């Protein structure tokens, strides 16, 4: 019997609707999972900034650090321009909680419209150009020159490589348990652009390759290397070729987006932010102001993110059962939200997932 | 009108597709009033193996002093750094002032899936391609490397102006009565200002200001697209893009993504454009697995020649090449292995020539 203290950070828009749905899923897990939750309600996001002048209250971070074992983030309504006193609360949370990996599974449902795909993008989420170190080096009018630093470190790159191997191993354990897969063998694909960035991407590649040596249980996992541009080209036409894909920050950002495009509705696509002592689940869709409040938001991405978080926390069984219950609802196609072409609401689809659980 | 064209087949299937393109150029309709003189030039991996230099200075000299434009085939790039070798195409672009890499992607009329008719205009001189890197810390097991990304107002303004020129040209074609999936001309500026506020801020500002540099640009619509969702939209709704202007890395990635939309890589054209020269080049490489077998697809090269002709002010000749090519492709009788058939290079050249 394990208890998880989960920080709920619904934040903005449909985040306020899908997080309550996920709370209800978690409250109703079957007894065989031996998993109970305590929830703590936390404030963050654009609304928090409008009401208080801080997107990420200090109290939110402190409560996550001192009280919580994990967290679920909804969505932020990001402004389209720079706003004084505002910085992204998700970006800040990840930094503060030490969540160096951004993990996005892209997995089509058997029988769905669309190109079959079953991959995970493992994006290093601390460095590259996202160190945000820039200077206007020449300031003569009409002739300005700006520079930015792209930083790649061995320690950060080794960590992300090691996590890619962990995920590859975890997926192979699932196949061996009897779950059907389009992959016969596990594969980690290291993404780079060494023809241009010989030193920085050279170090990224070395670090990821060397990560395989960190656990002898990784040795049998196949490893290959691919140029980012080639990956983008291949995702459109043969995305079934990829299993686990590990990438530095900018390449991983772009690849996670290209891969997610293969799924009809973004309301289906999950993610998690992972560190050594903490995991924060997060659906990939944004705050959807266009439908917020209307009771129709698709909570499937959030359910699948909670499941992914549970996989990282050593609750493989509970995660598998969430995926099975969700997949059964979608395959039957009787209770579907409007983004999937149906006429059901958030609560109704939650009810159907719960009935299968 | 006379065009003196340098022919730089270089390696592999470059030696097959450039001759095919020569034959196409020699047999253009009388009506175009276009006469070609060709100069044969040496560059590429083969050149390096024989002489120790991939790009002879003499090749550069003859381009500068004798040619109006050039057609490059493909280089067989090594898999690792080789002492004395540097990419002759990167060097030719630098030496000839070809700052703009232009990558049109256009589907066939009647193709399955979303239609596409876009042009990616990639700034091709700076960004991370300045290749200024250093291992700043060398502590064993804890190394740290850094690279500089440089964005300049002058280079960004030049590429923005080129994007508006191309948008205006495409709009003039629509107005002539040639059907287009676009009803309004649009330049979309690619950026990631949420992270690169200074460098991409300067890129965006420079591209927006470029519109002010000629009054004939004023009717072109302008918007902005974040790198975060560029590929998402490209794959799902490519029909929404007309002209796309981007800095070097973002444009490199988006151009290769867009190439995936139209089937065989043997179909995908490019041109490298400067103020005083244009060099056509297919996107495919040297294809050593098929080189010498007479099965290379010359369509990318034909379309690259047409694109070059557009920049040189020969719009009608270009239009006629595109028409002849698309007819071969849509009829679907004469197709090389990359198009699923068993026809050869010469067969598809002949079919294009028959149509034109």
From Swiss-Prot, chain A:
EC class name: oxidoreductase
Entry binding sites for Mg(2+): 229, 253, 257
Q: What is its EC number?
A: 1.1.1.87
Instruction: List the signal peptide residues.
Output: none
One GO BP annotation here? lysine biosynthetic process via aminoadipic acid
The protein's matches in SUPFAM superfamilies, at most eight in alphabetical order, are given as: Isocitrate/Isopropylmalate dehydrogenase-like
Any Pfam family the entry gives: Iso_dh
| Pathway in which this enzyme or protein is active | Amino-acid biosynthesis; L-lysine biosynthesis via AAA pathway; L-alpha-aminoadipate from 2-oxoglutarate: step 4/5
What cofactors does the UniProt entry give for this protein? Mg(2+)
**Superkingdom assignment:** Eukaryota
Q: Where in the cell is it found?
A: Cytoplasm
Query: Which residues get modified to Phosphoserine?
Result: 78, 88
Task: Cite the cofactor comment.
Answer: Binds 1 Mg(2+) ion per subunit.
Q: Which GO terms describe its molecular function?
A: homoisocitrate dehydrogenase activity; magnesium ion binding; NAD binding
The residues listed in the UniProt record as binding (2R,3S)-homoisocitrate, with positions renumbered to this chain, are 78, 94, 104, 123, 130, 193, 195
Q: Which residues bind NADH?
A: 76-78, 195, 286-290, 298
Q: Alphabetically list the UniProt keywords.
A: Amino-acid biosynthesis, Cytoplasm, Lysine biosynthesis, Magnesium, Metal-binding, NAD, Oxidoreductase, Phosphoprotein
* Catalytic activity of the protein: (2R,3S)-homoisocitrate + NAD(+) = 2-oxoadipate + CO2 + NADH
**PROSITE patterns, per this entry?**
IDH_IMDH
* Similarity comment: Belongs to the isocitrate and isopropylmalate dehydrogenases family.
Q: What is this protein called?
A: Homoisocitrate dehydrogenase
Q: Which organism is it from?
A: Schizosaccharomyces pombe (strain 972 / ATCC 24843)
Query: Gene symbol?
Result: lys12
